[PDB]
Subunit: 509 residues, 4 copies
């Protein structure tokens, strides 16, 4: 009954996958923990199985990774970049089958599965350039005969815990940057995307092996809360990068702080689009639709709140309704499909509960709101009007395609309503007004980590630092100087002179 | 019997101090909490009194500071820099009496009290430059017709909790940078340096008032653990900068993390000097003496571990003992005095406790070890030989002038011994060897935030970022890009084109 | 008959000026060249005399400056910054009388004379911050056991030749930055602002002398084309910063290039304001008036071309005409005056010549065009319509308040018309259109060094790099990384390892 | 008799070369100028022919390149980076045959021909990273309601004139950087490496055409001084990057300055190695040998002056002589060969002239000094002792393997002797002394653009800016912020507020 044993899924074996897969890699493959089966969310059929990490596997792997670091940190950063360049090429060679696996096991449409691998590929090439650039300034000392230099050095072992919904690119953004910065990595992906984690690790492991480097430089320990909690408490994990829910990330952040470790937290979002009276509606309507229903509403950057100026609210809602009806639903890997399943049946339950709560709280479902009657975890993309902007359910991140629509009149109030929630990931205004745009970008504007104009809430690219504020946790990935989170700064004074310190009346020899 | 009522301390009134002083400033002066008397540690005589903050004082002050922020954040950063320039000049005008007050209330020698004010003065002038420079890059977007900009904006209210031992400069470093970054400040200094906090706040208040700015931009709430804990828990404190012990800072860090605030932690040190066989001993011996006994061993950067190559260990110890015997002890304001008292009577008891534990664990006191028979909190500067490097007492920060001396043979082991403690603030090697110097600066070298060569563990200047790693807490102050900790980064994509997104087969209006 | 001998102008002595002044400073004051008398352009009366540099003076001064450099370059940059900080304070103390001298000898209104000194003061404070920041990155070498560092070091002697119209601030921007970068300076100002040059040099000389530094660090050799040509040809002048006409600057550039020196060229402008149909006309009209008539049209950044969309052309011209009639003319040191005299009688004659040329080429004088009926070099601020945008006189920089007005219809054509002249200093558009703004800032937009939006052509501040492209010469002053022009870059590889190169089959010992 | 018509050289056809090759590419291939034949310097046999550019070819190519720029500058920099990435891959695929062509037509050994292609490959990958990074800062304006941004835009057409001795990598460093900065390029290579220029252009043209981009983005006009002089005088060539002799580059620099263009000059070297008394002689002797004789002394970074402390001078010379005798001479494609021919017979004549001049100026040839009796342009690598450090011939760059050896005693004199020549490219000291190393790197140290320690004068890598000072011309290539030379800076103030300027007593409408 496993999909991997059916001839039409034989392409899975191009990624090195089998009926039962080892979920631990440290140079050798293994796994003594519980065996997990992952399921295709489009049809609820089992794909294949992964043997997860026991405690003993975790111990063995952390030790091997930290021994590997002694070799890896001695490799000049540009030569570490060459390894990352080869990882990029190795991903390129498997981009179609890896993207297909992302679609099969996670459930996003094929163009987004492929696009996720391409993002990892492109971050590799960015990191190759960074590998010749990272460092700090040489500064003019106030002391004669002294140099003053800012050095940056790897922190050591970077633990990377990732979420189900970007099962390739979040790891990749952390991996590429941590690697060129001289760190070794230990990955614990989401249990429901274990095959993706194994497949990516097979690709990287071959590059490391072909370059005669210890594979534990990019270690893997598949598991769930058990392994993740161990990483959060483990003093040997010098930096823990955690992408996931605010609820879990809060506890991870506390555990890392308890041991004076470093954490990089990429947590929940509740992202608003604001359409002012002067907005180009032919831009607003498709922008809101694709940002709200993309990935079936399961992006951290998904648009979940849409504020529309009262003068245009009804027209925008009507136009969105007509466009929602045209969304093409199907298997996520099938041609021209725009909309696939939610990742789990529990996500369907949370969807239904939020729709019910919105209705009981005075909202009107103007489109969608129901489960779809087909195999897998499909729900209708949903638009809710009439709720108060401070309704409890509107302030909650429900990881599903529910778009709460609100009216506003004035700029100051709607900026405050963007900022009033606990999350702080992405935000967008649609307007032509020059002053409003720079106020939005200013100290009295959006409080989010991503602050966009005339592009919706998923508007981000690898050249910038990606992340959020407030309960989104404060970490950054990929661009700008995000690399500094993966290294330790030292401020270094070098006395190269023959000068002696003042004796201060003491008779020294 | 208050020193401020005695003729030879009449200079205290030049700072605006009187017998009983208001310890709350938010534009108005007040203080309805407990009245604290601070004492001169050189003679245990009371100086004057300060009315501390009640809960109601704290609440009123936080609200007024956040109201002032609405005004302050709208002032262009270069004009904020002009205010910080005037603060610098106002400190210059009072540098002698303020330095004298540091010597009187805190107990460090006069040149260091004056020197502490000078560092604040110099940070002000550095911040004036920064006020025309802070910001982020404009990046090349991959998207046609889009701009990509990294913006930086103030976090809002920066709470600043400071230690007794640098009662002017730690606050000043945070104040000057936080101000040009567009933040308002709330200061809670050490209770035993309350008069210093009041005096500094009087200087700043006059500058703000002369510029017709709300005084709550630089608010003061004197108090102890009650006020500091409230700040740690207060969601209105956007960044909490904490300088203090690791024990207290750990709890502050956890409380801030619990509420997804920002913390900047500057915690304990256990700083090593390492002298290799090729070291210039005429440089090593005075360097170690002044870095170990300076400020009576009460700098966070004090040298507390001295590793000496076995070939020169006995010679260096003998030379140190002969030099320690020449240290000039007396009132810290008297001319040519090098060595004053410890800050508190509790510090004297902690000193004696550590000396006893050192003896139990196998160490030998070769110089000092006892309380001096004189008024005030004077203890002998102390040298202990023969302890194992991993002795529990050697791994502890005892904030007293106790220098633990160790032998070593090879570079790899002694670098490891530098790194093996939980603290990670400052570190120094003395050597002539070019390769050893660059290895010390590299990934297998010192793990501290300050990594020095042929200058001891207090070698730092305002152009660099100041702080440590590990249990020193990770925060940075003053130079390089430390300013970014006082601001929030946004990555901003601006679509300025008339281009519409691809319709993806949906028919839009 | 000298103004300095009349009681009405006795304040001139507060600047150390006498009836006859030494125009050479190299630590000693002297001048064996021709004695020049400078005149007040508001009343054509002689002010006082300056003894200019002979060739022997020039030779002696260059030698003393280069000897002084040996001392100055050994002073740590932050301590050089402290000298520059004190220069800023000394300027502050004389700001009113020095600004008054700028008004008296050069002729601009008092607020602009004072404002020029204030700009120098604020550049000093900027440079104080830079003095702790200048330097380059430490980069990750591809070679094991090697460091790679980018160093910056002073070029040596920076010659500074300046124009009459900013007789304080151009020198100051070069002086403050060159000084913190470790260079010594040699100033040759405009002959007609010799008293200003002497007065500034007296202020700086006292600071240097008070700090026990050789005065030749900021040397002065007053003179005309002969001294300027000598500097252009002198291999001992490592960097020649030249501010002045394109005609003279072209020759200075060729002379410096012939000897493989460095030049920093700040040459002529022909700056355009473009008002689009959507512009705020209540912003456009005052912006254009003040940018066109400010300093009697004698700024390098003066607006000389005004392109107005055809739909609003007639209205904007009518509003400009009504406002020009209200310009208040008089002695530039009187506070109601917006508008002072031109700098020379020749300038008045050239104004008249340009007006006649504009009429010959088909232009209509709609306001002004004539000399004013009063003593001093006063001309009417002048507006000319009906010329072709490619009229010869419109493409010429005439240093007089003549504003040439043109119609346009389309964005691409008017951007091209902005760009079609040989000058490339400043440019401004007035518009509300977001896309037009970013196209103006982009690769098909303005070709100038200053590219402004809704602020006119004088919109610049010290935090940015100031300068132009094309025949404006390409140099930059003040902000961003302009400091790099005053230093030499080295890319430094340091092998700190014991590794030997591969023998490649050769037998070495 | 053409090598390309012989079966042993059929591999040349892998580069698309034939008996007679078009030497003009602008999207179409042509060439109506003179047909040049290039010869193998190892045996003086003709290889193949190239049809060079006539004036009409040049004029059409410049126009086509500037038309192509309209498309290219509108492509986002990251997407321009993607093109450069594919150029790197296309070079990778041809690296062996292209390296072999460099050895055949230029004459350097095969590992260096391949290594030159590899440097271009790695610059492409570095540029891919930079394509997401280039830009300037957003700065904090002193003006309320204004933004201040530093923009960078392409200059347009970058003409690239290259020397014979790095016929791939110099072009590639300029091409990759100019391309990601949004410029189109026009290449005129050395006439004696025309086949290399054609082969590289064939590789790039295929990438451009495969991407449906106009081929004139990377245009080629093969020719000699006629085309190069036309480029130097052509106002349509916005930046002219020139690599070549100081003698030619001086005139190029003057012609570009005459038209207020931009030049990037990479001119001659006269690079010194200095061996101090404490140097590692097992490091010095091989370092000096390989840096002096590598590429038969035809690197711009070749070591030409060797200063040895008097205490070790005779020993180092004796060891160098014994090592020179082991240099393996032969065909530069033969695997066992270290030393091939000079590039031309004129180079042989210049070598002989310099050897006899050195003897006439008092030098002694202690090794070599003769032409080799064999086919091709072979001369003996040569060592000359006994010249004064200021002998005219030692101050001249003779592009041939002649090493002039000098004694010295003290550091200050030998630093001055490094600096006393007109050239300023590279420089190296060998020493263990920490203070001497930092003095060498400081303001009283080396005046060159490359300043090395314990690595010889060819020690450079792509992460750093490459170039020299003084008569080396000042330009930089490849790393750090060298990219700014290929773009134009604008300083942009944006008033986004509704604020109007102060009326200054004028009543506007
Ligand atoms: Cl001693
Ligand atoms: Cl629509
Ligand atoms: Cl040898
Ligand atoms: Cl008006
Ligand atoms: Mg003139």
């Amino acid at each position: 009954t496993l999909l991997i044993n059916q001839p039409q899924y034989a392409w899975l074996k191009e990624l090195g996958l089998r009926e039962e897969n080892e979920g631990v890699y440290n140079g050798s493959w293994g796994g003594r923990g519980e065996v997990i089966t992952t399921y295709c969310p489009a049809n609820n059929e089992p794909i294949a199985r992964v043997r997860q990490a026991s405690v003993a596997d975790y111990e063995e792997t952390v030790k091997k990774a930290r021994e590997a670091w002694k070799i890896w940190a001695d490799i000049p950063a540009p030569k570490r970049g060459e390894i990352v360049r080869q990882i990029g090429d190795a991903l390129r060679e498997k981009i179609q089958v890896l993207g297909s696996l992302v679609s099969l096991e996670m459930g996003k449409i094929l163009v987004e599965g492929v696009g996720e691998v391409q993002e990892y590929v492109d971050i590799c090439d960015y990191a190759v350039g960074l590998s010749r650039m990272i460092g700090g300034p040489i500064l003019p000392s106030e002391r004669s005969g002294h140099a003053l230099i800012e050095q940056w050095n790897p922190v050591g072992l970077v633990g990377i815990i990732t979420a189900f919904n970007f099962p390739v690119a979040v790891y990749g953004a952390n991996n590429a940057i941590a690697m060129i910065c001289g760190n070794v990595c230990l990955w614990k992906g989401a249990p429901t995307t274990s095959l993706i984690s194994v497949a990516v690790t097979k690709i990287i492991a071959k590059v490391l092996e072909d370059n005669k480097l210890p594979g534990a430089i990019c270690s893997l320990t598949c598991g769930g809360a058990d392994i993740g909690t161990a990483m959060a408490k483990d003093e040997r994990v010098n930096l823990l990068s955690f992408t996931g829910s605010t609820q879990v990330g809060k506890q991870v952040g506390l555990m890392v702080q308890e041991r004076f470790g470093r954490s990089l937290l990429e947590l929940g979002g509740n992202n608003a689009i604001i359409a002012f009276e002067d907005a180009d509606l032919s831009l607003v309507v498709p922008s809101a639709l694709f940002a709200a229903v993309g990935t079936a509403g399961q992006r951290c950057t998904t648009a979940r709140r849409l504020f529309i100026h009262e003068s245009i609210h009804d027209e925008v809602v009507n136009r969105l309704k007509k466009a929602y009806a045209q969304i093409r639903v199907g298997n996520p890997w099938d041609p021209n499909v725009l909309y696939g399943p939610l990742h789990t049946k529990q996500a369907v339950s949370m969807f239904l509960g939020a729709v019910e709560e919105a209705k009981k709280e005075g909202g009107t479902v103007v489109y969608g709101g129901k489960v779809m009657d087909r195999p897998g975890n499909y729900v209708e993309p949903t638009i809710v009007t009439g709720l108060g902007h401070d309704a409890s359910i509107a302030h909650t991140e429900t990881f599903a395609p529910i778009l709460y629509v609100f009216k506003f009149k004035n700029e100051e109030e709607v900026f405050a309503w963007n900022n009033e929630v606990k999350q702080g990931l992405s935000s967008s205004i649609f307007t032509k007004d020059l002053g409003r745009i720079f106020r939005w970008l200013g100290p009295k504007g959006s409080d989010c980590g991503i602050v966009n104009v005339n592009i919706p809430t998923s508007g981000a690219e690898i050249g910038g630092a990606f992340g959020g504020e407030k309960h989104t946790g404060g970490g950054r990935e990929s661009g700008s100087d995000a690399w500094k989170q993966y290294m330790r700064r030292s401020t270094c004074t070098i006395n190269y002179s023959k000068d002696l310190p003042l004796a201060q009346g003491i008779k020294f020899q």
